[model samples]
Target: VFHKIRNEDLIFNESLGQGTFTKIFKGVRREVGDYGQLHETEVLLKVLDKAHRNYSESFFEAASMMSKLSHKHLVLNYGVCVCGDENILVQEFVKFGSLDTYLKKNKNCINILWKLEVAKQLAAAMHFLEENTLIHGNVCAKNILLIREEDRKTGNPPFIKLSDPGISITVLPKDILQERIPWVPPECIENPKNLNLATDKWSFGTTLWEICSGGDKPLSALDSQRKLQFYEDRHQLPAPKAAELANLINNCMDYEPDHRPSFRAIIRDLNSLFTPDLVPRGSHHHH
Candidate 1:
């Protein structure tokens, strides 16, 4: 049995995101807290279209997929609401919204230090995926959400939450699918199963460029095939925004899958992100 919800009952804050098959809206579930005060919980509602083709495969898979995944750095799935012909996925709302919006609003006052911090969080999330054997097929600015320290009350650096996982799962051999758009590996254009950590590294590399350069168009300096060419025509990694931040973009962007660095190496390098610089003059670096 499906229950229909009235649009008026639920306040629809403007759309937070959109895709070919769905759009996300911000909403809240309000109730009295244990302390007897009214409490409101922020959530992102992903509404699926009934008219789209592949509804079953995509919708069901999305539900099952969200249920199976969980991580502090990944946006969380709360539950689902099924109406007459549509489905809505409810997730914990990220306070700062998407990365693109943050960059657009803060690009001027912001320094590379903040972008570097974002990269560290993004890399940490990717390392989690690589270790779990899942590749976030579309890792880009639009797919990341920021949570400010003041809001979270954790004293942690501004963290990033990875979202939009419908296209994240990939099969290494028999069922590999092609790229969605700009954030794909050159090989995926020809062969999908060829996916590996190397390809994921490629996307992360390009993402690094997007964060540091304030929406610089990725691969702007190269042609499609140029991603495969070495030297003048090949992919080039951007310089690390800071000395401690090791640049993985160039190596990860390599056309040859064998050449990319392992996520373990990526994690090791990102330790700098976790490392605090204001240690007492003689205090050893915190591990």
Candidate 2:
């Protein structure tokens, strides 16, 4: 059920970014035996390192599962390619890149209204995942992509696409996971082997904090991991200016997994923050 793209069909360009055990390249896809018919298709061609044989099989499996999911807020997974030493996962490339880089560069360009919209879109995506009983093990600014709309005014809010969902944390290399510990939940920190919907919600809260704080890293700057855990244990989280938004973040970051609201509930709370003038009448609220 995967798109069987040949190596010859892909024209690799410069590196867009790099992942834990994979290198992302900007590439174009062409039809078999027809280079003239080639279209300017931007895609993230993720190639797993050949040395990490431990992660190769699982990466392909994750790609297969991702290919089956389709959602506007979720990044489109084109397919997988396995030829020779290369194991690739091709995904549609968003023009503006990851939210983290965007915020770091253009944080002043967007307003709080735009940030709220981004939060709502992510909530919608999370709602979809909750409905399907799936978890986006990695939910951070780096995992969110921005879609630039043609003819849109400068400073207008763009569409958001959630990427890298459903990847098993257990398969990822150590350093990558370690680097994202601040965004992860206390439960996950306490037991690195654990991952579930509750943990995903906790990560979502951390992401919300990042969005609210204009990409500020969660928790105070501390090199000690145990100290960070102590902070999380005490339910210490960044406070957003909006009371409603702050409450939502607190609910999502509850120390007890069962105490956290469901993604559906989070979506409802997010919808409330959207001004009536900005959102369509019937579409603003979700049941």
lDDT of 1 by residue, 148-254 (tens): 73223554467788885563334222222222323677677656656676778888877876777677665456554454443334446556555444355666677
How does each model score on TM-score? 0.73, 0.84
Q: Give per-residue CA lDDT, model 2, range 1-287, as digits (tens).
A: 67777777678889988766678889887653346664656778988876765677667776665677888888888777655677888888888888877877776766767778899889888888888987777788888988973224565567899986534676665555656666666667546677778888888888888888777776546555654556556856758786677888888988888888998888888887775555555795795
Q: All models: lDDT? A: 0.66, 0.76
Candidate 2 structure, TM-score to reference:
0.84
TM-score between candidate 1 and the true structure = 0.73
Clashing pairs in 2: none
RMSD of each candidate?
Answer: 6.6, 5.8
Say which candidate scores most in TM-score: 2
Compare the candidates by lDDT and give the number of the best one: 2
**Candidate 1 regions off by >4 Å?**
1-11, 30-39, 49-51, 149-156, 168-182, 219-233, 237-247, 272-287
